Amino acid sequence: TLPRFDLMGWDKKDIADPYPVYRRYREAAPVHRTASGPGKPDTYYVFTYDDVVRVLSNRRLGRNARVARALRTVVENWLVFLDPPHHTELRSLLTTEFSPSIVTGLRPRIAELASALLDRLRAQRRPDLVEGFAAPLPILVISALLGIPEEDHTWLRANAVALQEASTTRARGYARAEAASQEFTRYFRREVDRDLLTLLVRARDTGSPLSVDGIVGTCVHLLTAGHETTTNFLAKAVLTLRAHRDVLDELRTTPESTPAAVEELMRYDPPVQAVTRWAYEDIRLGDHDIPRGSRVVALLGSANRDPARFPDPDVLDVHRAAERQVGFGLGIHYCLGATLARAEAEIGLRALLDGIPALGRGAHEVEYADDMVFHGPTRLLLDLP
Numbered sequence: 001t002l003p004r005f006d007l008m009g010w011d012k013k014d015i016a017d018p019y020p021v022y023r024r025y026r027e028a029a030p031v032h033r034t035a036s037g038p039g040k041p042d043t044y045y046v047f048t049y050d051d052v053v054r055v056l057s058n059r060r061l062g063r064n065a066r067v068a069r070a071l072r073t074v075v076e077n078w079l080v081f082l083d084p085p086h087h088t089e090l091r092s093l094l095t096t097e098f099s100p101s102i103v104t105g106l107r108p109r110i111a112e113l114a115s116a117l118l119d120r121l122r123a124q125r126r127p128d129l130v131e132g133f134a135a136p137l138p139i140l141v142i143s144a145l146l147g148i149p150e151e152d153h154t155w156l157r158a159n160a161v162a163l164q165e166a167s168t169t170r171a172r173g174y175a176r177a178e179a180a181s182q183e184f185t186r187y188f189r190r191e192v193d194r195d196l197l198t199l200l201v202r203a204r205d206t207g208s209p210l211s212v213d214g215i216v217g218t219c220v221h222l223l224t225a226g227h228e229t230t231t232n233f234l235a236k237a238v239l240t241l242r243a244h245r246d247v248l249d250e251l252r253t254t255p256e257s258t259p260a261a262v263e264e265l266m267r268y269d270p271p272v273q274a275v276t277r278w279a280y281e282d283i284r285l286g287d288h289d290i291p292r293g294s295r296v297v298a299l300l301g302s303a304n305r306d307p308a309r310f311p312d313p314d315v316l317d318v319h320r321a322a323e324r325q326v327g328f329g330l331g332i333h334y335c336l337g338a339t340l341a342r343a344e345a346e347i348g349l350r351a352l353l354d355g356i357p358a359l360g361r362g363a364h365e366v367e368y369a370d371d372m373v374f375h376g377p378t379r380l381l382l383d384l385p
């Protein structure tokens with residue numbers, strides 16, 4: 001027997017290494033039911049690659065529970081929380097502002113920022129890679145995309161961190177989050193009244209239906225999006241490579257391999273460990289007949305280590321075929337900043353490899369956040385030289 005599954009209330013040691021946990025449940029059964037009341041609604045956890053793909057592509061499974069606070073206003077038009085209707089119009093909106101075209105031209109600036117961060121990082125005995133590089137890099141890149149002042153990166157990040165307090169994937173948390181939400185709102189509303197902001201504002205100045213609240217809420221999502229994902233990718237990437245010195249060393253000596261490495265590092269330990277859905281109709285999955293209204297949880301980290309799809313899943317193999325891992329999702333809700341995130345991943349990782357020769361040497365001090373959805377270290381100390 002195994003205890004009832006749930007992503008909340010995980011032992012700190014399992015948070016550090018969840019994969020063996022996924023494996024035992026996955027070997028037991030592809031889908032696991034974790035009952036409610038009665039009063040319900042019941043939840044179903046999907047551990048298999050194929051079933052996760054089924055979950056993510058089924059139109060009958062939507063994002064919000066559809067019955068069988070400057071924070072509330074900031075979070076209310078975040079694209080990651082909208083279903084197809086509201087969702088379709090908004091996604092189409094900012095989609096091409098994150099095109100390979102814009103990202104490609106942004107890469108040189110991303111590298112410049114990564115380099116600058118390292119320069120400072122190099123000036124301390126035992127640096128924190130999270131607070132000193134992984135966390136500030138996404139903030140700084142998106143800030144340059146929004147035309148925000150570079151020097152605000154530290155303040156903005158502090159608030160992004162505060163905002164996380166109220167996350168449903170975590171545990172007076174709302175106080176800090178509301179404080180932050182109000183701080184962001186006041187901040188961005190002042191910005192609207194004077195470059196992605198320009199375009200979003202300009203859209204309203206020339207007839208495009210956009211509320212100042214919508215532009216503001218949008219800015220807060222984009223500003224905090226990479227901080228809760230890319231940051232975690234980079235920090236865990238350092239942990240993975242230190243644990244796999246053969247790959248770390250090959251990467252140092254084969255720069256052109258960075259892209260494939262990032263794809264495999266993403267498969268191996270993805271930043272977002274799960275995405276939730278709600279059944280709008282009865283569904284069958286695994287051996288389960290899932291009633292309309294049940295909550296369905298797609299375990300991306302579990303899917304990415306599914307031996308049925310990835311042979312020897314625990315081996316870090318940069319030679320696997322690309323475009324299979326589901327770390328950026330799959331379907332209509334496929335990560336919007338996937339292109340931008342991938343560029344920050346490759347550029348930031350290369351910066352670290354070329355910037356910290358002893359990255360793979362010595363011991364490290366790591367502490368993970370009590371979060372099994374946005375998964376990663378809250379701090380990663382490194383013994384340098």
Ligand code: HEM
Binds near residue numbers: 230326
């Ligand atoms: C490497 C880091 C990242 C990972 C692993 C990641 C992963 C994901 C996943 C799995 C989803 C699917 C959610 C669902 O099924 O409902 C998603 C959605 C989304 N992501 Fe990311 N993401 C990353 C970075 C970013 C960044 C940097 C931005 C901002 C520019 C961003 C913006 C979004 C948006 C707007 C959605 C919702 C899109 C929709 O519903 O159509 N992501 N992401």
